[PDB]
């Protein structure tokens, strides 16, 4: 908020000037009264011109100040929301800030305007007549106590009624969301009875709400009438005494009315400001809670005493002294216990988390030293849970790309992944937009889209896993055939964590891990024709 | 600015 | 159109039982308006008298009496109207909810729950403000205006012509401003919803975004949405201020034209000082009512539209068949399927069943196996009179199932759902769901039939505890055994199991398939594997909608 | 403006 410290200051000037310009209609009015009892037109014309000029200037200044304040507040709100969302996304609520900022800004503006007005009115009244101002100040608190007491009770009753209505609403939505069971058990009358019983409780509160409303209205009217009468009596007696004229009394009466209105507005506005200020601290607290240049990688990776764990604590490690290694141009697969959590190794391959020990340098360079922008487009692959975003298919199949690929390149990537048929069969070509969060997607289509998104970037390492698990048997066979038929076995490194032994049959060197480290391995034929884990799994 | 119940 | 008149008549008829309250409200409103109209006249006469104690005292007393009476009526009317509004709201909600329960299952399969919640929570309140709020303010506001202008014409037949000429320049401006605001608000709402959709999409696909490191693009898209919304916010904030400036300038001008003309008329000799004061008060006061009348008349149409939208749901006709009446005393339990074919109305002309035919017997425990695209669920559902078969017929004891009473049928035949659903009531209320009355002895007997007592009996007070919302505190296996106990508490004659053994114990399934509720009562079990073969007396496979 | 029920 500091960066806009100048503009706001300008606003804080203009309002003050406006608050002095609008106090010319009452004052001169009294002057006109003092003119009508002492009957030239020169003074009348002078008063008229002064009043008109001051009022016009006040209106213009108020307009300009409001424009400046709104323009600044819009930018502040947008910047705050952007920062909040960025922090939330990188951390791994949003609508709360959006619904809070407008209310906070509006209430703060109204509070400032009416506070300045009230200060100016009190000052001019005090300069006018000290005794009447003292009387008004003395009698203000005594006549502004009971209405607040009644209003708090009325507000409590209103909020109770609204909460009861919300409870009944759910009592109804829960019933209506499970219609097949209700119809099956023939229990519609029970639901109707429950709803009626819920409404019979609000029927009781509504009467007291109405009574409180009526009493509050009566109290407000009585206080409003009493306040004015109390000062009118003393003003009349003072005027009759002859110490002051009638015009001064008229000006004071108008000033007192405006001052009371300003005080009442301020009292009505303040609680909302307090609530919004208290609420913004929660958002604040929630928000407040360099690499070497890479050129090319040959696909050679290896690990020595590598360890990784969950972010919750380093004691949830799923690896201990691993020795995984995949040769460039060779495709290999890994196996292990279901509860061992070996899948995190794939995340370790994507540089999502730094190693807890040892090193995981690949292609002769440290793993976390390369640039993040170029590494993510050369070491990633299809995810474990295929999905399609709400963007266009031509953009969904190339998400996270610095430069949008050409139509021919996209078609070639889809064909290499088998997704060309899906693109051709989709209506309106690649310009069609897929449903948000895969609302209308299919397993085979999702697998094809994931494979295309993986292969579009020409990765130097493959971390494809669980893609065929969601895909069909025919799609899995096609993916395996494409992987096996790539030029010179794709001439790159693949470390796929396959779910079926059909893909692991042609593995260059299969391996299985236990206890956080690789415990067995070798050729697939040797593993399946010996005491290895693969043969035991096949026989079992 | 002036207030308005709305 | 005439549709608005029809809706207005329906809304009038909905408030028929509120005559004793509306009469008092419309009496107090008239009293308050008549009291508030006459005060400035007596103020002016007092001012004229000051410039004879009897007349002064009379005027003061009358002014005080009118002020007090108006103050009282202005609160009595508000209380009465608030009570009337509340009554109308509570009356309409019950009718809306009780009309929806009779609809067919396709209506709920099609309509999103968000629309139902919106109708039952928001529009039923908007349509309830029509009579107590809009038709009240409009009436008093218009009447007050008529009275003020009558008094102004009485005081001075010449000065009122200027206000009569000035009024259109205010009416047109208010109309234009309201028209612009009503569309700016909805544009802002649409922009906000579109902005929130981006965050929702980012949340939905978080794993892929973190895997690819594409946060720097989602942030940019969100910033673009925010920058698109900020412009609409600024436009609205500018339009308001412009309207306020125009209003202030116009009023000062009118007052100065009024003040100058009034003074020039008084110095001639055709007017007095109190008369000028009263005329100034009236002319100052008329404008606020003139503006609020336009505001309220513009606002009423939204309530009328909301009422139309609510009434369009409770007037729709259902698709249930003709109600039945038959209710025999002892059902034999023989069920036959004859050339049954079915197509979902939501996705028509894509049949799931093609001439299915089979026969069931009391002791013949028949098992259905085969995936058929999960079509085993459809044959189970239509055996409970939940859907009507488009071809063939299904009959119970040589009579169609649709000919039996709705209340009677679901006592003899009951099925367990594939995914059990539990309600937020107590344990006892869930077991005895749908029954008129039950005894705790039966609940223990029903619970012991499913071995669920091993969990229920550790819990304090036994069966009177509150189950978590939609069974939140229960485990997947625990919910299965609770749903089973909900069936044998009813003593069924025909039993249908939707692969309960997939989560429940196989031995428990055998006991449920061989107890008194299954010794001579027809049992049909659905299995995803050959596990049902160990007891099935008539195994039946069906694929592509055709039986094996 | 001035909506009091």
Residue numbers in the entry:
A (entry chain A): 180 to 218, 220 to 272, 288 to 484, 492 to 742
B (entry chain C): 1 to 6
C (entry chain B): 131 to 181, 185 to 681
D (entry chain D): 3 to 7
Quote the authors verbatim.
Peptides destined for display are first delivered into the endoplasmic reticulum (ER) by the transporter associated with antigen processing (TAP). TAP is a heteromeric ATP-binding cassette (ABC) transporter comprising two subunits, TAP1 and TAP2. Each subunit has an N-terminal transmembrane domain (TMD0) that interacts with other components of the larger peptide-loading complex, a six-transmembrane helical domain (TMD) that forms the translocation pathway, and a nucleotide-binding domain (NBD) that hydrolyzes ATP. In this study, we analyzed the structure of TAP in the presence and absence of peptides. These structures show that TAP suspends peptides across its transmembrane cavity, anchoring their termini in two distal binding pockets primarily through their backbone atoms.
We created an 8-mer modified b27 peptide (b27′) lacking the central lysine at position five, and two 7-mer modified b27 peptides, each lacking the lysine as well as the adjacent glutamine (b27″) or serine [b27″(Q)]. In contrast, neither of the 7-mer peptides were able to stimulate ATP hydrolysis, suggesting that their short length compromised their function. The resolution of the 7-mer peptide-bound structure was limited to 5.1 Å due to greater heterogeneity. In contrast, the structure of TAP is heterogenous in the presence of b27″. The final reconstruction, determined at 5 Å resolution, closely resembles that of the b27-bound conformation, with lateral openings filled by lipid molecules. Despite the limited resolution, two distinct peptide densities are apparent within the translocation pathway, each attached to either the N- or C-pockets. The density in the N-pocket is clear enough to model the first six residues of b27″, and the density in the C-pocket can accommodate the last five residues of the peptide. The first three residues (RRY) in the N-terminal binding site and the last two residues (EL) in the C-terminal binding site bind in the same way as the b27 peptide; however, the remaining residues of each peptide density diverge. These data suggest either that two 7-mer peptides can bind to TAP at the same time at a concentration of 150 µM or that our reconstruction represents two structures, one with a peptide in the N-pocket and the other with a peptide in the C-pocket. Either way, we infer that peptides with less than eight residues cannot span the transmembrane cavity to engage both binding pockets simultaneously, explaining their lower affinity for TAP and inability to compete with longer peptides.
